User: Fold this.
Amino acid sequence: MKFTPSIVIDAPQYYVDHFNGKYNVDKCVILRDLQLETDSESMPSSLKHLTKPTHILDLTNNDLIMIPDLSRRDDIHTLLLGRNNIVEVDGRLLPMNVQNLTLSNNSIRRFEDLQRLRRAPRTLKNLTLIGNQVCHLANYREHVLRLVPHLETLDFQNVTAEERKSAMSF
Amino acid sequence: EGAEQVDMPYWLYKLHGLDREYRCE
RNA sequence: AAGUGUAGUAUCUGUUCUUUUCAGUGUAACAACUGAAAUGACCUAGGCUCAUACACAUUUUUUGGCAGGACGGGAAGAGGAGACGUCGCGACCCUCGCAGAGUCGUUCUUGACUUGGUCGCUUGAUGUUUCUUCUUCCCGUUC
Assistant:
């Protein structure tokens, strides 16, 4: 149920396809540094036993409410958050060099809830929010661009200077 | 741990001849 | 009034008893007796189960080596910029599809034989290589 180190030790640990490295988390449930899939992760915690060797984190298909409780992980480049219930984002996330975030199919409602993504310095190049209610709200794309200009590709679409300028105009 | 100081018819089945290995072919 | 010895028998009761094998004696077969000693691993009582000279003299390791305050972005205003390459955001474009690839011998899967590219960046990222900062506003850390 809980993400605990006993679970941290023994999931299917291997190397991504992309050759991204990691060591996974499954004594009986939810995982980390690879395939954190399908074990009903309520709250992220106990990332310390990850002890840094992980490029990627496939959190998908859990019951995560928010994204806090991230120990300092220099190595983590990619977070695959899909199919959870992320309502909010922490803010002091700042895991330096988090290049990719996958928020697909979650429950982030408001633009303002997206604000904490601006904190990601210049590393968050790829962000995908598609599948959230916030996407339907007006001027969603432009607000994400003006809020986090660090993003190079949003919703698998590329930013482009045209809508950068429109984001400036509004 | 806890070493504190202070201060059935065996011969009968052989006698009767049973429980001895044998085989009918 | 009581009473002995030779041979032999029966019957109580007390007492003893396997960690496992192997081989010999013994036995009608047992029993009994005589000798030795496996230890380790694995599978669901069992096992054709398993085991007990040199690396300093040209291509490598004995070498050609040595020499309120601070920070960090991003923007504006005043007094970092040229080549030459190498991998990326977009596209008015190109192009249009299932397969390391292509063929054969033998068998239900192997052995042989041959042989993104272009344009922008409308302020993408990077190593030669020559020359010559201040002020203001915003957002993060620290005290």
